Amino acid sequence: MEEGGDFDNYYGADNQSECEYTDWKSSGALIPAIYMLVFLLGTTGNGLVLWTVFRKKGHHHHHH
């Protein structure tokens, strides 16, 4: 009878990385990786950094 199978584990899937089970059924887990590469490029530490700089050494100590 056909129950059990014979040699059916052809290796190859060299990834099993914890970086897809999150964006699986979403966009193929290939578009999000790019969406960020273009996001953090503007955020994270770009434009918002030098901003806090010219926001702390302002004037303050104003009269009172």
For 4-35, the DSSP string reads S-SS----------SSSTTTHHHH-SSSHHHH
What are the structure tokens assigned to 28, written together? 């193929």
Identify residue 32 by its one-letter amino acid code: P
| Residue-range domains of the chain with CATH | 1-64 (6.20.400.20)
Residue 30 to residue 59: CA distance in whole angstroms: 47
Residue 11 to residue 29: CA distance in whole angstroms: 22
This structure was determined by NMR
What are the structure tokens assigned to 49, written together? 């950094």
Contacts of range 31-36, beta carbons closer than 8 Å, 24 or more positions apart:
none
